[PDB]
Curated annotation (Swiss-Prot), chain B:
This is E3 ubiquitin-protein ligase LNX. E3 ubiquitin-protein ligase that mediates ubiquitination and subsequent proteasomal degradation of NUMB. E3 ubiquitin ligases accept ubiquitin from an E2 ubiquitin-conjugating enzyme in the form of a thioester and then directly transfers the ubiquitin to targeted substrates. Mediates ubiquitination of isoform p66 and isoform p72 of NUMB, but not that of isoform p71 or isoform p65. Interacts with the phosphotyrosine interaction domain of all isoforms of NUMB. Interacts with MAGEB18 and MAGEF1. Interacts with the Coxsackievirus and adenovirus receptor CXADR. Interacts with endogenous retrovirus K protein Np9. IGSF5/JAM4 interacts with isoform 2 through the second PDZ domain, other isoforms may also interact with IGSF5/JAM4. It is found in: Cytoplasm. Residues 11-97 form the PDZ domain. It comes from Homo sapiens (Human). Expressed in heart, placenta, kidney, pancreas and brain. It comes from the Eukaryota. Coiled coil: none annotated. The NPXY motif is required for the interaction with the PID domain of NUMB. It is however not sufficient. Disulfide bonds: none annotated.
Length: 101, 102
C-alpha cells in the first residue's frame, strides 16, 4: 500500500515592512536538468515565519502574493519574497506519509 | 545582498543485510497542480541502514537507484527499486547545500 498526504495552505502573514521573513529557500528551474519546486530549507528561530508557525523546513512554496512560482524565475521568486510590504500571502504545500523502504 | 544557492549530487554505496530495510521513507514522485515533485527522502529511521551510513539525509532528492534513473520510471517502480532484496544498493542523491535567505 502506497500512502501519501498533502496539505496545501494559505498563509497570511503580517509583518513590519523591511522586516525579513526569516527563512531560507532553494530550488526552482534555473538548471538544465530540473524544474524543481521552491523548498523551505531553513527557518530562523524567532523570525517572522518561525513566529507564525505554519511554514516549516521541508515545506514547498507554491505562490507568493497571487503569483504562481512556476510562472517566474527563481530570481523573481526571491524578489517577490523580498518585496517591501507589511503583509504577504504565501501558498505552501506540506507533504506527509510516503513509502517506507 | 547575495541570494546564492547550490545543490550537489552524491553517490552512496550501501552494504546491508538482504533481510533489512533501508530505514527511510520516500515521498513525491507525483504532481501537485503544475508542480512535479521529485522523489525525495521524507524521513530517516534513527539507527536503520541509512542512518548508520549517515550520507543520505532528510530532504535529499533521489536521482538513481542501482543504475535506474528515477525520472524514467513510475513512482511505484522507484519504490520497488528501493525495496529490492539485496546486500548492496547504490543510490545517487541530490542535496541542497545552500539557499537564499529571505
Ligand atoms: Na530547468
Amino acid at each position: 500500500l502506497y500512502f501519501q498526504s498533502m496539505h496545501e495552505k494559505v498563509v497570511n502573514i503580517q509583518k513590519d515592512p523591511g522586516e525579513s521573513l526569516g527563512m531560507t529557500v532553494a530550488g526552482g528551474a534555473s538548471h538544465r536538468e530540473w524544474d524543481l519546486p521552491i523548498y523551505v530549507i531553513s527557518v530562523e528561530p524567532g523570525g517572522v515565519i518561525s513566529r507564525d508557525g505554519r511554514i516549516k523546513t521541508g515545506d514547498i512554496l507554491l505562490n507568493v502574493d497571487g503569483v504562481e512560482l512556476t510562472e517566474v524565475s527563481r530570481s523573481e521568486a526571491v524578489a517577490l519574497l523580498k518585496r517591501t510590504s507589511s503583509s504577504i500571502v504565501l501558498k505552501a504545500l506540506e507533504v506527509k506519509e510516503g513509502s517506507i523502504v
